[PDB]
Amino acid sequence: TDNVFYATNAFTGEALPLAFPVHTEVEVNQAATAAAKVARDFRRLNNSKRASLLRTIASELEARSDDIIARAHLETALPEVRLTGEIARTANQLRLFADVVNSGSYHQAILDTPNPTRAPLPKPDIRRQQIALGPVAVFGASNFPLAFSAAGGDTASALAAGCPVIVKGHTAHPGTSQIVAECIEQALKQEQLPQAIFTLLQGNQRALGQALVSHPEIKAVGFTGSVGGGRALFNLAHERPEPIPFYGELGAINPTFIFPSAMRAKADLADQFVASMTMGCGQFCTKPGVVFALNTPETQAFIETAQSLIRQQSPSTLLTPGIRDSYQSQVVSRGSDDGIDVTFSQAESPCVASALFVTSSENWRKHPAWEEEIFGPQSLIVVCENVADMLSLSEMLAGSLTATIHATEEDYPQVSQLIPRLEEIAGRLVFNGWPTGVEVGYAMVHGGPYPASTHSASTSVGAEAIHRWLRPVAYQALPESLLPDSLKAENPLEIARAVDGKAA
Template sequence: MLDKSTFTPHGKHLIAGDWVAGETTFKSEPAHGPVHAFSVGTPDLVERAAKAAEEAFWSYGYSTREERAKFLDTIADEIEARGEQITEIGTQETGLPEARLQGERGRTTGQLRLFASHIREGAYLDRRHDKALPDREPAPRPDLRMMQRPIGPVAVFGASNFPLAFSTAGGDTASALAAGCPVIVKGHSAHPGTGEIVAEAIAAAIEACGMPRGVFSLIQGGKRDVGQALVQHPLIRAVGFTGSLGGGRALFDLCAQRDEPIPFFGELGSVNPMFLLPEAVKARGAEMGTAWAGSLTMGVGQFCTNPGIAVVEKGPEGDAFVKAAAEALTGVDTQCMLTQGIADAYTSGKSRFDGRNAVKPVMTTDSEGRNASPNLYETDAASYLQDHALGEEVFGPLGLVVRVDGPDDMDQLARGFEGQLTATLHMDAGDTALAQRLMPVLERKAGRLLVNGFPTGVEVCDSMVHGGPYPASTNFGATSVGTLAIRRFLRPVCYQNVPEDLLPDDLA
């Protein structure tokens, strides 16, 4: 049993099993609690980690599925053994409540175990075998077998808004390790202590399972030169990223500009539009307005699936929806955001709506420091389609209601949206015809479609898709959540007339 005392970070990087200090340090900026010093990452550390990851791949990439599954299960066990300490430093660094961190920890260990189970089953290998046809005319067919193989070392960038589930041992790391790919994590400076203690859990699992030490490294802090060195290192074969559109697009471009381009799997955010259809609004508009306010302000709106836009027809029923949402938002207390930078970006994003002739303030507040309060605005479909800035994500509890004249207006607006992570229909039975009209449009716009629900909350399971057309993500054929996420770090290999003793064990 581990010591349950307070965790005090040592502030070092984990490079292939060694805790390495740097020449310079940066200070954490916790919402509350003590400030700690952490070593600043460098391109030299990237070089060391990448070489160790490549060396580790020659054994880890050819390990058995059971060996990797046991490793993932052990990482989950080691994280749980440090649960109280993770919660303590996580709440200090992010300002998130204990219940949120405990739930996120459960999600993190759950997805590690889900991938362990997934690779044990083996279906992800997509094994195929076309037997030889030596007598086929006009030409014989050779013996052909195919299966998915790991691609090599993967770089993962930790996310600011999920210090556990999308960071050090989050979904990108879990799926890459499950595939057989060593991982180098660029830790997020918003929660370096949380990243460090989770890295300690992974290091303990490496030791317990006898895995090669280069299978995982964590590089803390660092400026753009560290991220650039990581995505452009010739030994890195793919990148997983969750973050802002600007930062993600810059890294995506660097990946494309390499002498040998590599895939960049970036999840870049979304406004997640909701379409409130007429019969549903008539029956329960006020109820939906109150529920929307709750979803909009959950976690101070710091979710990539936050439903930032509600589309509703003009008229008294739509007015009731807007009024109920505004009243509910008025009762929401000021909440601490994850970082000062995110709080500043929220204030800046709000300023895009203030003073615009086509935008009506419904309920506005002023936010101070790292704390944020909700805001609600309203515009019409024509104004929204003409002003691109209204469709840009504001990361925080800000909602925009877009009023439409009828079904044609709603359809045109749906066609005008950029790529989204989610799109939602709120409907009753009488709305079915309009919903059927909108579905083909929304399918092309989003990776996940919901009916009569709210997208905040991403289930970790086989059928989940967390991705969508650009700019929601940089690869519309991938997901960063769910077991399909493993496919990002695999490639098909065909074996022609290969003797059984040369085939991978999973094909023999």
């Protein structure tokens, strides 16, 4: 390629060794064209074969643990202990989808029992199943370089679904992505499958991502990042001659409601709060960004404990220069406003200071520019006049990944009113706990109403994430020999199937 670029050492701001190519529409077209060419064969593989591929990728990842961790550590400044845990998460996530595919449940086989002798017209034999949309484009998250990136949840679920994947490598961690790509390449060689099943593209020129999202052979997109770029790419996906599904997690402030009784039951609630908002130096998509509380002594004590803890926080090294500068200018800018109080920790640039904002519900209603997310070790506390004031505020919240509630049995009557409101604005409700942890299981819902997600009827994490890359096809009166195995009368795959409305 005409140009190359280097990763930035997260700790020094200087370039790290190893040059990466700056791909353009030329490579996009080649990758997409090749991906399209193997799409059909890939979705028609036996479930066990595709399941094996996912397990092999998981294994290859673990075999390169050292390289990944060392490289990702310098590119992102995330501690090694965290990266070691993320590698495992990533690997187990791949295995989870391996089980799903092998399971055959994703087929969602459904069949109507024919009825030749019904009048006036006979009831035909109809059977439907899910199949892969085709090549899928993936943009990884900068804050989770492994579990939400090259081999993250979007890639994993898309491959499981039977969709070839093309990753637009994030410029914040090119070296990490490349190693992951080397792992997937090896997995494909061992499984003896086409390399075009997975392609990693690199480049620091936005034209790349734009060309990838607009390519006619791309049939869906997975994205994790900022609302600005995320919405721009989303719009691009819907202006195409053929609009394609766009699953992007754009941001959230994850509203948290804390009742007085909860603060009494847990003396260290403030400590727990500060630990949640400062985890990963506050760089969690699920970070509790705003806390609504009642105007009682408990809250004042709570605020004071949190404040004291915030002052003691060690300097934080964020993910990218850009993310650092946005954080610095935004917190300083918000703390300048009237009606808001801010407590900062001690920190010298390039490091950033943790912050805790405090304001009243009146001012919260007055400054609508406060519901916006500020990515970093920062959070806001909104002191409300009473519970009714608190419920009123929940009615106006924007979409969020999560919504948390801290209460005891004596609050249940009001909590009962709050839940229906939170269900409407969040993808996941957390009770007497914190939103940061995200369990990769079967019941997970990671996403929610806009901006939490650009497709609230889905999840980017959990077994159900696979459905985002599938579409149903009905088969009418086809002979047994022409029907896909999943829909044959004898059910040779022995998968769960729903007949005439009865549970599978």
